[PDB]
């Protein structure tokens, strides 16, 4: 069967990377059918690269503070946790940052080799002081979804190591809400409103296109049970 | 069209306090039941039994 009334899609910007997407008119109840799935996908289907582990000179058990820099260790930890990076290899990549002298150490001071790119150099990190001299080492990779911090089993081998979570999916948050567009004249049609909001490394719309790709692939994996099955279709464009 | 932003009145016997009546902007609803926003019922003191 055909949808019998072609729905549309409109992307509306709110910021450089945050945008809403209005779809209308979906068939009755179809807002939920795809919205929750789609938000789950966006949260758990778009590849990206994020920090995985850390180790810095000076600290072996002092998981509170380290000299040179003034703030605590958790502050620097959470600063680096929200770091946008892109990697082109599934091996573990390493980056260093080493700033001598007091000042404000930022994410522009990190020296990422080619194959690992940073999209927020101007993100402050540390209030280095007292002629502080540091050496922070970041174990980074790429994946998808949210991977919590995997602790170091080889505690002795990497004993100054620090396991950390990873927001591999480049989107930060997406929400969806349904509506009652032309329920009376056109039999309970509904309009979905999506709101997607993503890192600066990528856009809001592109990860959406990739989510559409992944999900249409995932459902082709199922439609290949009866290739000529009469479902529903859309029509022209 | 004609119901485009045309306020109407909702009353319930008894009306005791001033807010026993309320003006609402109405929207067309399929069916024969008036759908009351679930917040004003306190003032209306109206339950759906």
């Amino acid at each position: 069967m055909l949808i019998s009334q072609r729905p549309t899609l409109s992307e509306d910007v709110l910021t450089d990377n945050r945008s809403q997407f209005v779809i209308e008119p979906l068939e009755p109840g179809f807002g939920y059918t795809l919205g929750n799935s789609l938000r789950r996908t966006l949260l758990s289907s778009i590849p990206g690269a994020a920090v995985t582990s850390i180790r810095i000179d000076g600290v072996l058990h002092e998981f509170t503070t380290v000299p040179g820099v003034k703030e605590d260790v958790t502050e620097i930890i959470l600063n680096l946790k929200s770091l946008v990076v892109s990697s082109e290899e599934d091996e573990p990549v390493t980056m260093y940052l080493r700033k001598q002298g007091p000042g404000e150490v930022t994410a522009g001071d990190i020296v990422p080799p080619a194959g690992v790119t940073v999209h927020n150099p101007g993100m402050h990190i540390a209030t280095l002081n007292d002629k502080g001299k540091l050496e922070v080492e970041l174990v980074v990779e790429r994946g998808r979804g949210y991977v919590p911090a995997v602790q170091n089993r080889a505690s002795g081998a990497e004993i100054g190591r620090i396991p950390v979570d990873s927001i591999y999916s480049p989107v930060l948050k997406v929400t969806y809400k349904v509506d009652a567009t032309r329920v009376e004249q056109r039999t309970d049609f509904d309009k979905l409103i999506l709101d997607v909001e993503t890192k600066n490394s990528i856009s809001p719309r592109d990860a959406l296109a990739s989510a559409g790709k992944t999900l249409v692939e995932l459902f082709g994996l199922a439609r290949e049970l009866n290739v000529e099955a009469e479902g529903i279709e859309i029509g022209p464009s | 069209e004609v119901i485009a932003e045309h306020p109407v009145l909702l009353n319930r016997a008894p009306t005791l306090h001033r807010l026993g009546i309320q003006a609402f902007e109405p929207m067309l609803v399929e069916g024969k039941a008036i759908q009351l926003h679930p917040l004003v019922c306190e003032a209306f003191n109206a339950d759906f039994d």
Binding site: - | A13, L16, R18, L19, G20, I21, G31, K32, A33
Partner: protein, 49 residues
């Protein structure tokens, strides 16, 4: 299922017939009738100003 259907308890009227003595509308769902606005509604009605 109880015998209190919303198919039975709706009455609408823009303008129907009118009372004999007064020109006022009549009461009832059977006759096109008309809705009653009481004094106790007039109270809140002024309290709104």
């Amino acid at each position: 299922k109880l015998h209190h259907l919303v198919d039975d308890k709706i009455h609408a009227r823009s303008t129907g017939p009118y009372s004999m003595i007064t020109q006022q509308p009549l009461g009832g769902k059977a006759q096109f009738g008309g809705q009653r606005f009481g004094e106790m509604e007039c109270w809140a009605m002024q309290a709104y100003g």
